Every structure is written in C-alpha cells, then in structure tokens.
Design a protein around this motif. Structure first.
Motif, PDB file in Angstrom:
ATOM      1  N   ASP A   1       0.856  -1.178   0.000  1.00 23.22           N
ATOM      2  CA  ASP A   1       0.000   0.000   0.000  1.00 23.22           C
ATOM      3  C   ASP A   1       0.910   1.252   0.000  1.00 23.22           C
ATOM      4  O   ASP A   1       1.487   1.626   1.023  1.00 23.22           O
ATOM      5  CB  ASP A   1      -0.908  -0.041   1.246  1.00 23.22           C
TER       6      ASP A   1
ATOM      7  N   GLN B   1       1.159   7.069 -11.009  1.00 25.48           N
ATOM      8  CA  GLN B   1      -0.265   6.883 -10.660  1.00 25.48           C
ATOM      9  C   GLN B   1      -1.043   6.561 -11.927  1.00 25.48           C
ATOM     10  O   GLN B   1      -0.517   6.687 -13.040  1.00 25.48           O
ATOM     11  CB  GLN B   1      -0.871   8.122 -10.009  1.00 25.48           C
TER      12      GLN B   1
ATOM     13  N   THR C   1      -5.002   4.949  -8.474  1.00 24.42           N
ATOM     14  CA  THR C   1      -4.038   4.009  -7.874  1.00 24.42           C
ATOM     15  C   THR C   1      -2.629   4.622  -7.899  1.00 24.42           C
ATOM     16  O   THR C   1      -2.216   5.206  -8.918  1.00 24.42           O
ATOM     17  CB  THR C   1      -4.035   2.646  -8.612  1.00 24.42           C
TER      18      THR C   1
ATOM     19  N   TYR D   1       1.328   3.486  -7.785  1.00 26.94           N
ATOM     20  CA  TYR D   1       2.135   2.313  -8.050  1.00 26.94           C
ATOM     21  C   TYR D   1       3.528   2.419  -7.420  1.00 26.94           C
ATOM     22  O   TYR D   1       4.152   1.410  -7.139  1.00 26.94           O
ATOM     23  CB  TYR D   1       2.261   2.080  -9.562  1.00 26.94           C
TER      24      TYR D   1
ATOM     25  N   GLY E   1       5.192  -0.505  -5.274  1.00 29.34           N
ATOM     26  CA  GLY E   1       4.021  -1.315  -4.909  1.00 29.34           C
ATOM     27  C   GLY E   1       4.207  -2.795  -5.211  1.00 29.34           C
ATOM     28  O   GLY E   1       4.557  -3.160  -6.320  1.00 29.34           O
TER      29      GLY E   1
ATOM     30  N   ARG F   1      -0.050  -7.454  -2.038  1.00 29.83           N
ATOM     31  CA  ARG F   1      -0.712  -6.236  -2.552  1.00 29.83           C
ATOM     32  C   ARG F   1      -2.107  -6.567  -3.066  1.00 29.83           C
ATOM     33  O   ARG F   1      -2.257  -7.548  -3.794  1.00 29.83           O
ATOM     34  CB  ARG F   1       0.084  -5.659  -3.702  1.00 29.83           C
ATOM     35  N   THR F   2      -3.105  -5.746  -2.720  1.00 29.71           N
ATOM     36  CA  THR F   2      -4.446  -5.871  -3.326  1.00 29.71           C
ATOM     37  C   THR F   2      -4.737  -4.785  -4.386  1.00 29.71           C
ATOM     38  O   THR F   2      -5.601  -4.953  -5.225  1.00 29.71           O
ATOM     39  CB  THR F   2      -5.523  -5.854  -2.228  1.00 29.71           C
ATOM     40  N   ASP F   3      -4.020  -3.671  -4.346  1.00 27.63           N
ATOM     41  CA  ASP F   3      -4.108  -2.654  -5.415  1.00 27.63           C
ATOM     42  C   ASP F   3      -3.624  -3.230  -6.746  1.00 27.63           C
ATOM     43  O   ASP F   3      -2.905  -4.233  -6.769  1.00 27.63           O
ATOM     44  CB  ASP F   3      -3.232  -1.423  -5.071  1.00 27.63           C
ATOM     45  N   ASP F   4      -4.014  -2.589  -7.853  1.00 26.95           N
ATOM     46  CA  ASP F   4      -3.609  -3.072  -9.185  1.00 26.95           C
ATOM     47  C   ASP F   4      -2.076  -3.162  -9.299  1.00 26.95           C
ATOM     48  O   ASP F   4      -1.343  -2.396  -8.651  1.00 26.95           O
ATOM     49  CB  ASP F   4      -4.115  -2.139 -10.286  1.00 26.95           C
TER      50      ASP F   4
END
Ligand SMILES: O=C(O)Cc1ccc(O)c(O)c1
Ligand SMILES: [Cl-]
Ligand SMILES: [Cl-]
Ligand SMILES: [Cl-]
Ligand SMILES: [Fe+2]
Ligand SMILES: [Fe+2]
Ligand SMILES: [Fe+2]
Ligand SMILES: [Fe+2]
Lengths: 359, 359, 357, 356
Positions: free
Chosen positions: C160, C180, C185, C187, C204, C322-325
C-alpha cells in the motif's frame, strides 16, 4: 635533398613499437606498468616487453636496460616478408648503413632490418611477429586510464623539408604542417595507416626522439591519467596538457618517464586514408595551432628530447637547426602570436599566452 | 570582528542567482545565450533573465544594462517567507543598510531583502519566486556544453577569517581552506546545500566578485566549451583551465564574459551534508591545491575581479589586503611551491610550475 | 489502518547511510562487491565484510554478514545529532513498534544506534555516531573504471504505497516523483531527505521486501564499464535490466544481481531537490517512457523479485500481498497497455511489452 | 560459387556514401538533419546531400525522393581514377550489368561506375568527388549527438559463404564471423579501411539493406541520441540498444528513419589494418556475441530490412534463405543460447534472454 631511389619503397603498414634504453629497469617498469597500465608480454632482468589493450602483435614498447637512456629503434611493420628485402635495397640505395637479422633484434620479432636512416634515426622494418592474446574485450583488466593502441612517433630534426621529402618518397603522406610566410617549415605530420600520423617531424637540433604516443578510447581516460599522477604526487612529471590540439584535432597530454623520455597520450583525431586527403597548413604565429584553447606551450616541449642511438649502440651526434626556432618566433623575446589573424586584440608580443613569459 | 547577533540567522537553502550589470546587452546576450547556451526566462531592452537546464525557479542570472559593469546582487534563497523577516532583523542588528521590497527587485522574485553586508557585498534574500518549466529532460534543447545548475559564488575580501566567522554565524559551514604554517588564511570554501560551496572567500583587495560558477553533468561538457571557444576564435577569453581542482576535487574552467566578469564551469565535487563533514586544509605552497595536476595559476586569476555595487548602484570602495598575497608567496619572484612537501625535486622557486615565469 | 502521526517530534534524518545484507557465502559475496564492483574494505573478518564507496568518510555503506538465509537485516539512516537517536526511539515507541537500542552499536564503526521493526515491517536503523575513515575521493591511484562513488538510496517493496508514503512524509521525507493512474491508484513513489531525488523509495508489491540498494558513479561511462566487465567475466546473466535512462529521476541506471540475488542499482546524474517547494512530478503508469525513458521494456523479474527482510530477532518477516492493481499487469500483462505518445495507437503496446517482446 | 576474375580487382579505399530513396523528403530531412544533426552539402526539391562532421568528400548520404523507399546505391571510393576502369573490367568479367557515367550519377561525384553485383546489390565505384569544408573543428556546430563519420554498410543475403568469397576476391578481409558447430555461417564482417568493417553480410532473405552505420566520438554521444528521441517522444523509433557489441566490440544503437531504413550509431571498434589481423569466430548460440551484456535481440532486427533497387530503379526480387535462421536457432520456439559454454545456468531455451 635526399634522392628518390629507383628501388621501390617497402609497403609500410604502421608504426609498431619503439625500443627505449632505460637506466633503471625497475623504476621504468613502475612507470609504464603500475602508473600507465601497459600489459607485460615478457620480462626478464634486462628487458620488459609491453603492449596496449587492443594489440595482437607481441609488443608496442621494449624497455632495454642500458647505461645511456636513448631511443634504440623505432619500428614499422611492413605488409609482407618481401617488403623487408625491399626496405634493405631501398636504404642501401640511399647510402645508409643497414643490419639484417633473420631471427630478430628483440623477442617476438622475426626477420628484421635496422637502418641508420638519412636523418640519423634508427628505424626497424619487420613483418614476422609472435601473436599474443588480443586483450580488446578484457574489461576485467581495463584501467580507468587504459592505453588502447600505439599511435605514433615524433622526431626532432633540423631540416624539416628535407626529412619530409624523404618520408613522402617512402610513402608517408603529409596531413598537416606548420609554416610561416617567409618560407620556413617548423613541423610536419605524416601517415601510412589512416590516422593523422605514424611519425612526425618537429624542427630542432637532431636526431632526437620527441615522443612516443599512445591512444585512449575517450577523453576522460586522459583526464584520469592526470588525476592518478596527482594522487601519486608525481604531477611534476606532467609536462604539458591536457589539451585539444589544433594540428590533428586530438585531445592530448605529455608526460615524462623516469629517464625523461616523453610520452604523449592521444585520442580522437580523424580519418586520412583517402589519397587526396586535404593537407592542412597552420601559420606558426597562430596561437590555436598547437593548443586549440590557446594555452601556452612550455619551453621544455621545444628544447628537450631523447638521444637516439646508431646501430653500434652509440649516441648519434646532434646537428644544430639553422632555420628559425618555433619557440623564439612565438614565445621568445621577439616572438609573436595571434588569436585572430590581423587582430592586435588577443595577440601576444614577446611572451607566451595567458599571462606567462619564458622562465 | 563581526559579532554574532542575538536575532536568529535566516535559514538559507542555497545560492540562487546573481545580478550582473553589463555595458552592452546584445554582446552579453551573445555570450551567455549563444556561446554558453543558457535559457531565457524573460528579456527586454534593459535586462536578460537566464536559467540553467535543471532550474525551476525563475532565473539563475540577471543581466542588467548599466553604465559600469559590476555585481549588483548575489541572491540566496531562504527556506520560508518568514526567513526574509529573519534576514532583515539579523542584518539590522549587525548595523547594515537594508532595503525591503514586497514585490521584489527583479522580475520573477517576490518579497525580497537586499543588504550591504559587513564585507561590503550586496546580498539578497528571498523565498518567493515564479516557477518555470524545469528543462531537465529537454534533451531536444541539450547542448554539448550544457550548463545544468548554478553552483556557487566566489568573493574577493581582504580578511578571510573575519569573513569566515561572519558566514559561519549565518550558518555556512567551512569545507576547505588554504593556509600557511605561520597562521595566514588565503581562502575558504563554505556551504549551505550539500556541496562543497555556495559561496567562497578569496583573499585579496575587496569587496570584488571573483566569479559565478555553473555546473555541467560531465567533464566532456567543459571540454566542449573550450573547443567551441576555439572554433569561435575567442580562445583569448579562456582565462585558466580546464583542470582538476585540489580544493573541491571538481573539474573546472574559467572564462571571461564581455565585461570581464569571470564565469567558472564546474563538475563532480562531493557531498558535504553531514554536520561533521571533515574539513580539509591545504598548505598555500602545495602546487596541487588549486590545480591538482600542478598547472600554473595565471596571475590575472589572483589580481582581477569584478566591481560590486552598493544599494544605490554606486561602486563600493576597495579596501587593501594586508595579509600575505597568495600570488606573491607561490609564483612571484620570492614565492615557492612544491609537488611533494619537503622535496626540492618538483619544487618551483621564484616562478610558476611547468617552466613559466610571470608575464 | 493509517499510521498515525506521533505527537513526539520526528528524528532529523540526514540521508541513507548503509545497509546490512545477510549473505550465505561470504567469499562469493566478497568476490562480487570487492573484486567485481570495486568497493573499499573498511573492516573484515570470517563473519563480516564492511565496505564503503570512493567518496565516503563514515565507516561503511554496506555490511555483508554471513548467515543462513539471505535477507536485508537493516537499512540505516544517519541522523543529525546524538539526541536524534533518542527522538527516533520515542517516535517509534509511540507508533507501537518494536525497538532495540544499543549504546555501542549493532555493527562495527557505528556507535549509539536504534533498530526498529517499522510499521511497514522493515528493519530501520537510526544512528549519529560513526568512526570516520580515510575519505578516498582523490585517491585516483585506486579509482576503478567502474568506480562506485556514493551510496544513493534504498528501494522498498510494500503493498500500500499511499499508507507508506504518508508515514515517510511524517518522518520528514518529501516526495519528489510518483507513478499513478487516472483511477487514483499509486504504483510507486520516490522520497528524499538529502538534496537528491531519493533516499528511499516505495515500489508497490508484496512486502516487506527490499527491492534494491543503489550506488552512484561520476559519469555514465562508469556504468557502461560495469556492464562490459560483467561480459568479460562471463556473468552477463547477472545483468538484470539496463543500462538505461530513467524517466522518473532522469538518472542513468543499471540493475545487477549479487550472488544471493540481492539487486544493486548503479545510478548517476539525477537533479537537485533541496528547495521545500521542489515541483513533484507525477507520471501515468501507462507512459512507456516513465521507467526507461527510451521505452525499453521492464523485464517481469524487476516487478516480481526482491529480497526478504528480517525482524530484530533475525527471522524473515512474513509477506503481505498487494491488493491494489499491479503495475506489471496493467502495462505488460495480458490485459495491460502502454503508450509512447498519450492517445496515439502508433507506438502503443497492448497485451505485451515494448520493442517486440 | 562466384569465380575469381582474371582481371585485377579495383583498389577500394572505404565505404563512402549511400543513396537512399525516401518517400517524403521533408520528413526524412527532419529526421536526418533536425533529429540526427547531419550537415547539408546541397539540397533541392528532389534530393538532400548530407555529410558527417569530419567528412571532406561531398557527401556520405543522398536522400532521393521517389515512389518506393529503397537502397539505390552503396558507394565505395577507389584509390585512383584508373581503379574505376578496373572495377568496370572486373564486373564485366563477372557477367554483371554495369553503367558508367563520366560526370557521375549524383551531385558531387565525378566519373562513376554502378553495377548490379553478383548478390543483387547496387554498388558504385568512384574516385572523383567535389571537396567541401571539412567541419571536424567546427565545434560551434557540434551537437551533443554528433555523427562524425560514415562507418559501414550491412547487407542481408541468403548465402553468406558465397558472398564472403566474392568480397574476399574483391579485397575485403573478414574480421569476424558467426557460425555454428554444424557448419552454418550466419554473418561475416569485412573491411578495406583499417576498421572492423566497410560492409558486412547478415544471413537472410535478400538482397536487402540491413543498415547504414555512422560513428560518434564517444559513448555519451549515442546515449544523447536516445535521450533526445525520448524528449521528442519518438522512442518507438529506437529499435535496439544502446549496447556493447560482442562482434566488433563497438558501442551501438539501431534506430529507424521515416521509411524504416535502419541506421546504426557506432563507436570504438579496433584496428584491423595488418594483413594477418586475427579473425574472430563466435558461436551463434553465444548470448554475448551480438550484445555483450546479453540483452535480447528483438525479432524485427532479424526480419526487417530495406528493399534494394537495380540500375533501372526497380525493386530487386528477394531470394529465400534456405540455411538455418539465426532468429530461429537462438530465440525461436526451438532456439537456444548460453552465457557460459556448457553451463545450463544462464542459458535460454525456446525464448530470448533476460525474461522475455
Ligand atoms: O524503474 C525505473 O526505471 C524508474 C526508477 C527511477 C529511479 C530509480 O532509482 C529506480 O530504481 C526506478
Ligand atoms: Cl602540439
Ligand atoms: Cl583554484
Ligand atoms: Cl549485432
Ligand atoms: Fe604527437
Ligand atoms: Fe569556484
Ligand atoms: Fe532506484
Ligand atoms: Fe553494423
């Protein structure tokens, strides 16, 4: 004038190596190997054989222990074995002393001819040489100041036009020269391989050897040699430079070995291989001709040079130049130089550029 | 001796710009824009505003047309708007003349304070400045000689310890200096940003501005400036160099603009941001201290420097140095320098290194 | 799950100073860092090698420590004063982190030092006291054609980036650049204390892992020489990515892999960031010049591989996914894309990387 | 197999210039002059004549407007006017079509011979050329990316041994080549002037022109070309590099002009002028042979190349290579390459190096 022989000139490829007599072999090894990074092809108690990073012939430099420091031979490689015969007949027709050794004068050279040339210089011509590992991609060895090739010799001789004509007959073409408007020639540069020079003539008392020159890849390699000599607290052995030449357009440096033999480090001159390559003439009073940035040429550069030997190993007697002196006409008491032709502003009268006078 | 104020010093970030008065705006523009390649932020008939390749504040150099060439202001950026108030109170407590303009003295600067400082120099302190396009990746504009940053100023002042102490109180820390064994200080370098210097003091008659310095990325960039000046046949405006400094360890060059204002080009000094960064002191007779390769320092470098103005635009009166002269003790007729401390070999007595005496 | 700003004042951090890397074969690691890369020995014995760059005056920039599992053991920042070590202790205690204070240091040549398991799971050290050594900056008799002249930065993999970014900002790091997308998001972000682009950086991904340690050279040719040397040593398979020009940072760069697969970056010629309103640069994740300015593709290993880090007991920290793209997936994966010119299909890449791969 | 003529070969000095047909003269001018900084010797509405920083002959590159982008002539300069006679006799004995013009085919060249050579390439031989200002010290013009010389050509041809023997008879000496242990040759480099190459043969369907190469002084100049193309947002026209070559040891870059003609930028190869210069042979599976750092060669480098014209200006028909493909045997689905010979670690199967 030196007559053009009827016999055909040998086909010379390039400058190949010099043999220098040195007085303390260990001190000379420390200079050429530890300071400058040249690669050892062979050594024993009397000699060190050294080569540059990209060489495949046995050596570019032989250091031979002797009582009197001097040039013993400046060697040119020829195209074929038969060119050594051609050299011998050519120099005999010129009336020069010659010596032929079927098994060479130094290790790693085969059939070879040494001559006392018409200017009193000891030239060698050879074809045969022992190939060694070419280190051109041995980046595990590469030094920040790596010397990558042998580039040229420079000879001091009192009558430059006389020497020039003889070298032109032998197949060297003049690429650049320095003259004045009174008919005097001060220096000339001449080539076989397609660079500015394999040898060069500097006007002065001779025969003496002015310098041997080695190349680097890049300008920063030359800067590193300076920086290293500072760290070693031997900056007093930096004679002149670093600079940009006018003549040759090369980036350059002159340093002095333990016997005062002068070594030039040199890079990024231009291609001369075309037979009508334009000959560039600089006026002796142009203050950008030797150093393009106008930095003054130290007087030792004009006055000091190495002894040369004859075939017996005795020093050659010096013949005085009677033509005008480059030093005197540029930086001496009645000297003159300019930055812009016809402009008094940026001109120098009876002194050097950049605020200096002769010591 | 300049007392330390009770009022807190402004928090100074860095040197930011110089305002130079020039006599012919077009000829100055040719030099700074056409020869050196600086980038125009604003110009009109009275002024040219210039910046380096990586700058985002409005300018690093203001050229102002005036009758008498001179330094008008050396400007330092401070960390916050409130630091301009701190500067005003600081210099008022020192008893200096100050002038505050809420809308700035030059374009692209806001609230600013100019002072006649205790050494007679016109300093500016500002925070607010108009941001411009930061050109740091504009390789479509990048010159072979690109000036990438403003690095430092260098000030000529007669009493170096007096100036040093005053700058230390202002938060500058000394990185290097030059002294002799008998307690004389010839020069000091001091910084706010994490490099060797933001300003520097050269012992001499003063107040005068010695130079303004710009950085390049690489050494070859500095070499190109020399080469270009040769091609433009203005090599007479190359004063000194190129070289490697001892003090600072930076690669350098000094050139002279059309009003004889000296510009240094500079690269690859070291990080000084730690608070116990070790100081380095050099002996004045060490011939590697200014040029690491031992090349001689041209006497003009010691004697010539720019006039500075007071806040009414009149030339500040010069006050003579009474401490010993670096020129005299190193290269003058009674001077000396060494290559290795204590060694007569590679030492020079009554003249400069490399075989020259003073012109 | 914000990391709340302490009431206690932040330590005043000067710069990244050294890393301690655990290595499994000390002799092989010594070969790499000393014989290949030319770092300078400040101390060694049978268990550790202490190494510094050409211009350093503090005791070391890298400690190699023999141990069973290769990992980052500590990334160390120098602080401005001795009292800053106390401030660091109070700060991290308020954050609820595990701390360990050694008045005589954890490694040779460092004095009073605090190590912490930070809120992102990384072993940070803060120290002031260090034994000074000979600063080799003018020792051109030692200088290598590939000479590493400074430690420049660390780069950390963490899941994150905004959460980590705000934590580092509270600690006084200022963001200089980031990556970004339009959907919001983040990165990656780069942040500094000293006046360069970065002292540390967040990438990330699954973490905590150490992405790399970066050293500087003077010039671009020094980085080229490292590549050329590795070719001559027939270890070109340990060149991971580069050489190139970065978009972010504008630095010339190279990534290589040590014998334990710790990644080392070589880096030169970024820009000055010391002014407090230094403009922050935001790149779009789909801009194919953001990472390599010349648009060369980023190999997948650069996005997926990184070093383990240790807790204060020497045990490997567990990894959080990581759960973000994923930057890899949105740019070079099967459903990813990038462009050379925004909005132009010519020079864009869809479901693959640039250049024809 | 191409026979060795009884007639003596012409004495060739060096590669001297290429004539490229381009479709949009203004767009090509922008590339070669504005982007790459080449110097204009002459231009009109149909042609642009360009030279490198250190050249004194009239040009190194002629861009000629026409309907189909292609190589029109690769020109070599010969030592003497009589060598142009020798070239004509030599190629007539080979059975090749020749055309001789006493006043040249392009501006700034005099008496010239063009031939359709035995490999289908349009070669020119000339001596006479109009000298121009040599700009080698014009540092007032010098670009951060300056191209200082023309270095070489590289030709795609299906049978490398066949082409090699022909060029050797013509006096070119092979400096380096790429082979495998099954007796296949994939490429050869050969020279007249004392550098690694004046032309070179890349195994593939041909005749096609693979590239023209120009030199810089230093490696940073090649880096600057890349940086400039990033700033101009034309990084997609960077095909491959920058890198260090195995073969040639030169620092290099390949970029693509508006008609996809490939240009190499090249510096710092080595001296080859001795007649026993050691020949270096690389194995095709050695992943340091083309890029010394092991970076992968993009497939387009192997597959894409420029059309060449015959003497009437028509595209030469392409003949298919039947020898093994360098692409297929190194980076195709059945390809292989190694970092260290005999070591499985750092080898690549069925894919390119580095993870692609
Ligand atoms: O991946 C890239 O190319 C962007 C980037 C910039 C600066 C760095 O130091 C780094 O590690 C990564
Ligand atoms: Cl000279
Ligand atoms: Cl100085
Ligand atoms: Cl290749
Ligand atoms: Fe010379
Ligand atoms: Fe300075
Ligand atoms: Fe990094
Ligand atoms: Fe090529």
């Amino acid at each position: 004038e030196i007559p053009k022989p009827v016999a055909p000139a040998p086909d010379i490829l390039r400058c190949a190596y010099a043999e220098l007599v040195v007085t303390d072999l260990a001190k000379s090894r420390n200079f050429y190997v530890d300071v400058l990074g040249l690669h050892v092809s062979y050594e024993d108690e009397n000699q060190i054989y050294l080569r540059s990073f990209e060489e495949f012939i046995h050596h570019n430099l032989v250091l031979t222990k002797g009582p009197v420091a001097a040039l013993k031979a400046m060697a040119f490689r020829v195209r074929t074995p038969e060119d050594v015969d051609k050299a011998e007949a050519y120099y005999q027709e010129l009336g020069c002393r010659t010596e032929r050794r079927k098994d060479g004068f130094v290790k790693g050279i085969g059939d070879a001819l040494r001559v006392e040339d018409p200017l009193g210089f000891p030239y060698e011509f050879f074809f045969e040489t022992t190939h060694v590992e070419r280190l051109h991609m041995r980046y595990d060895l590469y030094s920040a100041g790596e010397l990558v090739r042998l580039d040229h010799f420079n000879q001091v001789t009192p009558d430059v036009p006389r020497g020039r004509k003889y070298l032109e007959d032998l197949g060297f073409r003049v690429t650049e020269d320095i003259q004045d408007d009174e008919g005097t020639t001060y220096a000339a540069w001449m080539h076989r391989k397609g660079t500015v020079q394999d040898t060069a003539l500097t006007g002065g008392n001779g025969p003496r050897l002015h310098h041997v020159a080695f190349s680097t890849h890049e300008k920063h390699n030359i800067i590193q040699i300076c920086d290293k000599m500072g760290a070693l607290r031997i900056s007093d052995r930096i004679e002149r430079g670093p600079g940009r030449h006018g003549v040759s357009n090369a980036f350059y440096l002159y340093i002095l070995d333990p016997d005062n033999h002068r070594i030039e480090i040199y890079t990024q001159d231009y291609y001369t291989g075309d037979p009508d390559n334009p000959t560039i003439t600089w006026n002796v009073h142009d203050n950008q001709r030797r150093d393009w940035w106008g930095n003054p040429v130290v007087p030792s550069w004009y006055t000091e040079a190495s002894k040369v030997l004859d075939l017996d190993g005795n020093v050659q007697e010096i013949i005085e130049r009677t033509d005008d002196s480059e030093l005197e006409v540029t930086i001496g008491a009645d000297g003159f130089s300019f930055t812009r032709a016809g402009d008094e502003d940026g001109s120098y009268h009876g002194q050097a550029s950049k605020g200096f006078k002769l010591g």
